[PDB]
Amino acid sequence: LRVGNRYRLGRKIGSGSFGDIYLGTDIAAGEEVAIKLECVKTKHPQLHIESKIYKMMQGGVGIPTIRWCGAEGDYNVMVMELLGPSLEDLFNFCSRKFSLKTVLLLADQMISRIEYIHSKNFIHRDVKPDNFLMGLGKKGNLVYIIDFGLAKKYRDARTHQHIPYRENKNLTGTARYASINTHLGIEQSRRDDLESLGYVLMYFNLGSLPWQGLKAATKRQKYERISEKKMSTPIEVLCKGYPSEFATYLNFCRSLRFDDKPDYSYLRQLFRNLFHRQGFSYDYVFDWNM
Ligand SMILES: Nc1ncnc2c1ncn2[C@@H]1O[C@H](COP(=O)(O)OP(=O)(O)O)[C@@H](O)[C@H]1O
Known part of the structure; x- marks a missing residue:
């Protein structure tokens, strides 16, 4: 073969x-790829x-x-x-229950990955558990990001001139994690990757999201039902029962202006101070490692 x-x-x-x-095997290199x-x-x-x-x-x-x-x-x-495996795979292996510690370990790294992509002038546009994979071997504790198939430039590499505020008629990536701006047909920018990660984090905490598993005939009526349920669920209801930092996170990302440079450091700190207040340490002992 x-x-x-x-x-x-x-x-x-x-x-x-x-x-x-x-x-596969890379024959020349004698390694799996x-x-x-x-x-x-x-x-x-x-x-x-x-x-x-x-x-x-x-x-x-x-x-x-x-x-x-x-x-x-x-x-x-x-x-x-x-x-290695995706976070979706690992989450299903863990029967769709992660500890707060594992959710925070993952947040810290996921925010940095998104930041990095933004540093290279692109929006990812498909932030979801399936698109983050753990490394192999000695890199088993490092979260990788994959799937650049929907990634789009948001600024000029030389000048850093941000793209203009504009419409985008496609709901491009996965509707379950899409931003409200995206549901409203507005071009995705840096805020929207971060808001999506907010939904991913809450999905890890809950096992599922409240707009997940709504039935519909057309693929566009499914998107419309998700859009409605997402817009009708306040952040404070969604995040009820979990540390307030999850809500603060989501509110901060929804409050960002289109061209704003997000304060990624602030967002990592939110979760890090929580994590330290809980008495955790960044030892990369995840739930699947026990
Ligand atoms: N480098 C990789 N190593 C291991 N598995 C991968 C890798 N890339 C992708 N996969 C697996 O295949 C699935 C689909 O990959 P895809 O979405 O097409 O990734 P990419 O576009 O980065 O190649 C992923 O959810 C993941 O499970």
């Missing part, structure tokens, strides 16, 4: 919004675009290394540093 003379494939290990991911394949018959080619964004992100903490991109047989190919 070959991809040229370069890689052998072992098995399929995931399928994201486009293409498929295989665990994650190989993403997009069929060259695609009339909506995305992999090359995603590969360039991953190239631009290289070097950051918790960004997987891109090994090789090209075309082999019937596929466009992107080969990446192989990572």
Whole structure:
């Protein structure tokens, strides 16, 4: 089962919004890798675009290394540093219950990953548990961020001139975690990644969100029902029963102006001071490590 003379494939290990991911062997390097394949018959080619964004992100903490991109047989190919399980996988393994300590350990790192992407001029646009993966081996305690398939530039690399406040008619990424600005058809900016992470954190605390599992016939009526339930659930109701920092977080992100540089440090501190007041330490002992 070959991809040229370069890689052998072992098995399929995931399928994201486009293409498929295989665990494979990098023959030259003698190491396992994650190989993403997009069929060259695609009339909506995305992999090359995603590969360039991953190239631009290289070097950051918790960004997987891109090994090789090209075309082999019937596929466009992107080969990446192989990572461990996703937070969605780990959360389901933990029966959808994380300890406050694990939620805060994860928050600290997730905020930094998002910050890093923003430092490189992009909005992620698909912040969700499936898009954060733990490292392998000695890097088992480091949270990585993946899926740059929806990532879009928000400022000029030279000047830092922010994109104009403008409409965006698509609900692009996952509706469960989308920002209210996004539901209102406004272009996503740095605030919106952070608000989405707020919903991810509350999802980790609750096991599910109140707008999750609403049935509808059209895919646009499902989005409309999520949008309504999200807009009708105040942050204070959503976060009832958990430390106030979760609400403060969400309120801070909803209060950001479109072009505001978020105070990521403040947001990490909110959760860090909570974490220390609870008597935890940043030892990277997660719930799945016990
Ligand atoms: N580098 C990787 N190592 C291990 N698993 C991965 C890796 N990249 C993706 N996966 C798995 O495949 C799923 C889909 O990946 P995808 O959304 O297409 O990621 P990307 O676009 O970054 O390749 C992910 O949720 C994850 O479980």
